[PDB]
Amino acid sequence: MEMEKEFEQIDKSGSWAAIYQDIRHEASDFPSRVAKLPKNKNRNRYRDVSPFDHSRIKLHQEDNDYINASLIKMEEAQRSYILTQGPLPNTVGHFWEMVWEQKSRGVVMLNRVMEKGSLKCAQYWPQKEEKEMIFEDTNLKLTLISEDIKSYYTVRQLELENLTTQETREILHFHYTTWPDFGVPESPASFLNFLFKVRESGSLSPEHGPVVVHCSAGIGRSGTFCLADTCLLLMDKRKDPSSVDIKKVLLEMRKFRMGLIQTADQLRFSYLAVIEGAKFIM
Numbered sequence: 001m002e003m004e005k006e007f008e009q010i011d012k013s014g015s016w017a018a019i020y021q022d023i024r025h026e027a028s029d030f031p032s033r034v035a036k037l038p039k040n041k042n043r044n045r046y047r048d049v050s051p052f053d054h055s056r057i058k059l060h061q062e063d064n065d066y067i068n069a070s071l072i073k074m075e076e077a078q079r080s081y082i083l084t085q086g087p088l089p090n091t092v093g094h095f096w097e098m099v100w101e102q103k104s105r106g107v108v109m110l111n112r113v114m115e116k117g118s119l120k121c122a123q124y125w126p127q128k129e130e131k132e133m134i135f136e137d138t139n140l141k142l143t144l145i146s147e148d149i150k151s152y153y154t155v156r157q158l159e160l161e162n163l164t165t166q167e168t169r170e171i172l173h174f175h176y177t178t179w180p181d182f183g184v185p186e187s188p189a190s191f192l193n194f195l196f197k198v199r200e201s202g203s204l205s206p207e208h209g210p211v212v213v214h215c216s217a218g219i220g221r222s223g224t225f226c227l228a229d230t231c232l233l234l235m236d237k238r239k240d241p242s243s244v245d246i247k248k249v250l251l252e253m254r255k256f257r258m259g260l261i262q263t264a265d266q267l268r269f270s271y272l273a274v275i276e277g278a279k280f281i282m
């Protein structure tokens with residue numbers, strides 16, 4: 001079926017939970033043996049969210065190459081994304097090592113450091129120009145260059161320096177700051193505006209390594225971001241945009257990381273975002 005009318009048909013019939021459970025039943029199951037080794041227990045935020053072995057990102061280290069991160073490679077759309085958990089106190093250096101080694105231009109953050117009174121990820125970037133951060137375990141230096149605070153999101157320019165080679169690179173930090181503590185946003189308008197700002201920066205384009213996107217577990221809000229982007233790109237590329245099937249795209253992405261889209265409300269929000277976004281594109 002088309003999307004917008006399939007949408008009203010699920011609303012009128014109140015069957016979002018049944019649609020979402022079908023997706024969960026059909027999703028791929030692949031091994032995640034490296035994630036479950038005992039030496040990696042303090043590298044995982046949640047025991048039930050792990051990268052598949054076949055698609056995990058490997059650090060270029062011979063001691064321990066493990067990070068909770070996955071490469072989602074979308075062949076028809078010609079887009080790649082790295083989805084990862086919010087960094088932990090003992091993985092902030094690994095996180096920036098990955099950003100360096102994979103040649104990423106942008107980092108997309110969809111959570112606040114504290115939500116619901118609890119810490120959802122480490123404070124992994126510097127907050128003042130004159131107070132830079134040094135990650136001694138991976139030999140990297142990170143400096144805040146500039147910061148632009150808007151009503152729904154903040155963009156930061158960062159400098160990452162490989163202290164071994166003295167090479168430097170500019171990284172863009174795109175921070176969506178207004179996702180509610182419970183539920184999903186009422187309108188997709190500000191999320192779509194944010195997606196378009198990431199696009200316009202070049203961070204999603206083939207001349208850079210894959211964008212790094214995270215929330216707390218790296219599957220819910222993060223899944224919503226890459227699902228909406230890929231679906232909109234396919235609607236631009238194909239002769240028949242109504243052929244784009246958001247459930248099929250989501251199942252393809254779930255071949256590369258488990259659990260993408262965590263609730264039936266997030267599924268409905270993803271439909272809403274693609275539907276509204278397809279009208280603005282033209």
Ligand SMILES: O=C1CCCc2nc3c(cc21)C(=O)CCC3
Nearest residue numbers: 192193194196276277279280281
């Ligand atoms: O933010 C939105 C909402 C509607 C869809 C949309 N499409 C475009 C933009 C922005 C948005 C741009 O600024 C450049 C490319 C076209």
